[PDB]
Symmetry: D2
């Protein structure tokens, strides 16, 4: 029986959810496509159902969004910023129940579900001020009586495809910034977090309707691969923002390039931590633990490779083992719990596969490595030593809490080893040597977009199009 | 026999050119690939020969450039700017002979040849100042004792592929900005402007060598499509800047994306002029003429489509015909010609094909349309009326002076036609209606990247990679 | 008897006001200086009393603020922004009662009282975003191994002196931006709006106190010119922001300069409207009316001089007279009045003096010019014709609704008259001539800081000090 | 007899100088005021004569500059930047002789005279690029159909008053930036460096005249106190840029404030060096020496106070004594010489006075302290120990090479001692403690505008005026 039909989960109805929900919003609610059931990863019970978009629903929604854009693009950016401010206030009023839904459907612990909603609230508050800073300079012409203007305009329709692991705040960032820039949006979220997508859209829809604005400014089309592919191939989708796996992202990027569209791609990464001989182990150990096991290793920034100087390798592994042993496991919406389930059964199979393969490649499991014997998708947070830097399994991004640990002797080799990795998202070094820190942050250092030391505002231009306008008034 | 072996072309030796030239530079000169002879389009006589890159040459050059980068990236940006300043000065000293070579090999009139070199000089002067301005903010962290830094680093090796029609200045822009940003460059120019590529590289190489810097900072590998394809597929080419046809650019874009590289594409676009009922015809007629036939219609920005309101259509066409009859076509060294020969014999065939296709599609040639019976690649400036706005040949960019003229009645009408084309590069409107001007430049107006009215500084970020660095110093 | 002791004014207690109020806040409330009673200008009845700062109070407050700064300056800018966000929310919760107080004590109509508080709320919303944007670049040094940093730090204590006519929002802007910049503030408001100053400070103090921050971050010392002079002469006041009369502002400026302090002066300016021959009169007439009589002519931006081309002068004056006759003047709580009483009885005498001086200088009162025979400080909206452009009384800013009207023939003429005045704050031109518009806004046009056409984000740097830091880490 | 009349100094005539020179330029050369003789500080011989501006000359020159501004302000900023580029090229051609004149008339060593001219050249090269970056944003209005524009215009006439110690490059900075911003300038230099002012103006005048521009764009009025005061009090001087002593600067600032003008003041400072217990003495000692004795202690940034940790105090003083003993003294235009004369006889008297007074206040001269027995104004570079931090003579800025040395025990007291100083221009710390460095650069650290560690681009907005322009086109 559906969780939403059980009295203990009646709080779900505060988000406007029912046993079966419409998964399309374009000013009207609908959905003629496949009906999907989403499940609670803590107990594998079905929560509720969502009727997804058909291709015809998607078509109509794109057309309705483009019609709504005619109205929206004529609203001054500071007034669009006021609408975004009101969305933030509306999220604020629902923060506890929406955060609880994030924990229930996605599986992250409650402080993180609430924290993700709060992040969206903070984004809306930030967007208010940003809405007053949109614009380009009037530059000096080389010709007398000519005005040279850098003009910024909305791209039009921004399609947004998001992933399971941050089912609220990635959409929130894209939506808030795209809205103040005068764009309309179309959201297709992860199918396994459909209820979260519907709940967020219900909150936004009410703000838009209360303001007598066309709802399609923030459209929703829940769906699977066919809807995602339709967006990637659709010339009416002027900008496609995608967050997800590197293999899928590459194909999305190629499809958008094939039609000369625009894309923003946020793809995976291996994240590494490097602890040198002079590191503060009182920072390293808890940093590595939270970076490795936070959200059960399902963050885009999850640490999966830990390089440790030979002199401290054994001690750090030991202290990690101790720390891992204190991790508190349970239902992720229970305020006492520090560690929840993996998001899907399939993730558990990947976890088991990765562990056995690491063994086969010569690795030693020094902690964990097993599925936990309890309902839901719980696995033990795992530490694997003895693998070589090159090990193929250690470069595959398995969204599970497996930490691969490597030893190194000097700065030269460890830097070389890391600079041989491609997708690298973030790099965290722990050292007290200031010169070494400069080398790692500089041109010859990490190639990562995020670099951290002793720790684990033209954003709007990405959602607009620039023109150079020359006016002769002489 | 080669022009360079004739006494009146002895000035070419001031550029370090010979009968047979090396087309590879990486600190040393060489070339084991195929020879290419380039021709003077004013008389169809061979100028001199260039030995192009083989695969081995390309491999060695990429390797030497990446080694040169280890030195270059360590040189402070303002000092890199001083090198670029010295390149500007060296171009200055050669401006007459280098401008004459551009005229000789490419075919543009001397004032434009010299003017293109002057643009590169001005770019160098600009870059000196820009080199003291590159960098990012230290931003306040939300956490006490944490520093948040926006870091900008060179991408590494910047591949630059350029086209025949601006064989100096497009390279110049890419090179100057890439250089001050701490990158090394690899240039593959248009094969038919190989001598120009060699001459520019000899000037730059001397500055680098005099300053005791490895010459491969600004490498050259002359070649055709096989070198271009190598660059697009090469993971060691961190950023590929491509200027040229839309069809080729799409392929380049797809290849670079397939390897998750970075690309900067400057692709074709048609250019339209729109004359509304209230236009100043004494502006419209000369603007249209010069925009349509400048550089024999071979600019990326050449006006090929002219839309005229019904009420002034006949008059504007009559006055254009009268003005066209006064266009003087001839040798690039003649100070009294408006334009010279087309770049290639093939371009002449293209011109004839377009003129015939225009007639087959129902157009009327009201002026020009013929090849001139003289040595070289000279064609008459041509005007075609009567085509429908959607006629295929008028949407084809033919690099020749052919102007297609269309009649319209309403603003809604002409806007729809114009924003029915996709690749559109520039839009020039002639009107006195201020409301109309704002509409055209605003969110619901032209989608071109360039919009002009009554006429026909974060660029460095494109050549660098951004990282967010967080430093815990608490 | 005091209005606050009458039952219908019990709402004032929601603002924490009493019969006798403390006018000093520095973490605690006090006041040993002279008492001041403020009056409601709608009925000339006393509202309540405030005990102002003595010299000892001012000394203690400056000392406590500088001690509070040691704590505040260590709080990260984004966290300071969150405090300012909470101030915005606290103002929101009190917006109706605080707006009513502004109406009661200052005399502006309720929609403007509420609207002024809303502006402070919007400023707080803006500042939240701005707090994440403050900082300077790391710039490339010309020397290897050297880092060049543009550092921004709080100036320290920011003294804020404000005027009667915007007794909330001017303070609000200064305070919000100063706060996110890491400064502490000391407020001295207009004595006749002391209750408003106390009420605003009670709202802010509660946020500070609830957040366990020393209240002297936003200190208040109510007082008259002797407190203002102390602030201007005080070396411990690092930056003095002054809003008010030109004569007083000059003195403040001189005193601050004498001690090499920093000042921000927002001084009087006259505001002119110029209607050219081609002006849309259906814009001109209401624009002039609302600009001239809004807030009973007591805004810094109030239009006091209207220049009309000879060809439309009589017509515009006739239509203004007709429109003026429809202006409804009355109680600030009446939703159907355009403006209410002048702020003081003295302002009424000033109004009468100006009207008489205007006649002595040869002007004709074509409408208004009289005091209304009712309780409170109510005067008729007034129009004066016939004065010469240089007439002394028309260059005097009288904070009352008196509009002086001048006739002109040429553009050169009216421009010369207008740029013969020095203190000019705003210039509003009405015309359809695009060339004229560019001239007026360009280098040879109006010298006003505010220029409007057909209508009547580095600000934070003003509140911080810049340093250039060079770090040799080689 | 005049140096310029002796054959050994005939190189002066390459700068267009004669035995008597016109000291006024406004498009014409003139000067009806007092005739001044300037002297060579290395031998006290007269060089040549300059006829300064009378009050009538000043009046006419102001009027001529304001007339020239009408032309200049209409020239597009990039073309103004081209003029500034040409000035840089003209300085380049004269760099050796102009640098020699700086050494001859001012007294700084030849590498510094040449280096100062090169600085002006570098400024011109920088200004070229800056000229393309002048402008403000078009911001979003809160009202539909309204355009909000941040407009920047020239202030008009910029008066520039400069000092003896950098008689070329301070003017150069002010002139170059003021020119690209569309202003005209009026220069009054130090009377004792009049020949340098005339020589620089001759170079600039030729560029302007070759370009058919009115010479008064860069006017010169050589003169003493009366001309300086006239500029300070002149309402036609829209911006007054002053560089010089704090006492004179304060009065200039007050005079400009009295007339509501604008000023840029660059005033003196005490510069301190602080060497902590862990400092690299191999950096400290040579840093202190060059900072103390460079330009014979006549720089605005000259180190006059050296705080040294008690543990290393004796060693650093000893090593300084050794280093001081190797200083090479002679004629400053002799390429072998490291140390020249003080600029005037009067400076020698100040030097002697300061030394005797330091003795009287209880200080010990451990090196130097005497006038050198040779022609010219040579004094011994001097080190004074034993004074207390509070010592009055050590806070007086005597433009002579006297280094006052203080001992300290811990970070708290030395920071307190330095933060008790007012005019402080720069602060240089030597330490390896990173936390201490952060404290000194942060809000609780140095109040100086320049802070250096282990070592001794909206500039244009200062020369323009901002307006907020609102355009209603609806």
């Amino acid at each position: 029986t559906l969780l939403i039909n059980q009295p203990q989960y009646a709080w779900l109805k505060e988000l406007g959810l029912r046993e079966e929900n419409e998964g399309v919003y374009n000013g009207s609610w609908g959905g003629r496509g496949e009906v999907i059931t989403t499940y609670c990863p803590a107990n594998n019970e079905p929560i509720a159902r969502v009727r997804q978009a058909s291709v015809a629903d998607y078509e109509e929604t794109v057309k309705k969004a483009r019609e709504a854009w005619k109205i929206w693009a004529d609203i001054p950016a500071p007034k669009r910023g006021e609408i975004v401010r009101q969305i933030g206030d509306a999220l604020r009023e629902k923060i506890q129940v929406l955060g609880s839904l994030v924990s229930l459907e996605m599986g992250k612990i409650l402080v993180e579900g609430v924290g993700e909603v709060q992040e969206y609230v903070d984004i809306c508050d930030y967007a208010v001020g940003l809405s007053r800073m949109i614009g380009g300079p009037i530059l000096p012409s080389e010709r007398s009586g000519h005005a040279l203007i850098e003009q910024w305009n909305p791209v039009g329709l921004v399609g947004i495809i998001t992933a399971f692991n941050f089912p609220v705040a990635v959409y929130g960032w894209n939506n808030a910034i795209a809205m103040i820039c005068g764009n309309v949006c179309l959201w297709k979220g992860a199918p396994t977090t459909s209820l979260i997508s519907v709940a967020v859209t219900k909150i936004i829809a009410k703000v838009l309707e209360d303001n007598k604005l066309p709802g399609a400014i923030c459209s929703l089309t829940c769906g699977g691969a066919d809807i995602g592919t339709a967006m990637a191939k659709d010339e009416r989708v002027n900008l496609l923002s995608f967050t997800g796996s590197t293999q899928v992202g590459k194909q999305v990027g190629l499809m958008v390039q094939e039609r000369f569209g625009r894309s923003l791609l946020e793809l995976g990464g291996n994240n590494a931590i490097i602890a040198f001989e002079d590191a503060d182990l009182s920072l390293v150990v808890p940093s590595a633990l939270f970076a490795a096991v936070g959200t059960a290793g399902q963050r885009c920034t999850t640490a999966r490779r830990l390089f440790i100087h030979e002199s401290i390798h054994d001690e750090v592994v030991n202290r990690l083992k101790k720390a891992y042993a204190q991790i508190r496991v349970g239902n992720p919406w229970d305020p006492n719990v520090l560690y929840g389930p993996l998001h899907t059964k399939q993730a558990v199979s990947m976890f088991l596969g990765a562990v056995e393969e690491a063994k086969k490649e010569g690795g030693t499991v020094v902690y964990g490595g097993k599925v936990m014997d309890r309902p839901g998708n719980y696995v033990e947070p795992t530490i694997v030593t003895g693998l070589g830097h090159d090990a193929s399994i250690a470069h595959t991004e398995t969204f599970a809490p497996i930490l691969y640990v490597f030893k190194f002797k000097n700065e030269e080799e460890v830097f070389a080893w890391n600079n041989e990795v491609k997708q690298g998202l973030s790099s965290s070094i722990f050292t007290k040597d200031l010169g070494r820190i400069f080398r790692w942050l500089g041109p010859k250092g990490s190639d990562c977009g995020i670099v951290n030391v002793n720790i684990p505002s033209d954003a709007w231009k990405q959602y607009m199009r620039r023109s150079t306008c020359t006016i002769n008034y002489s």
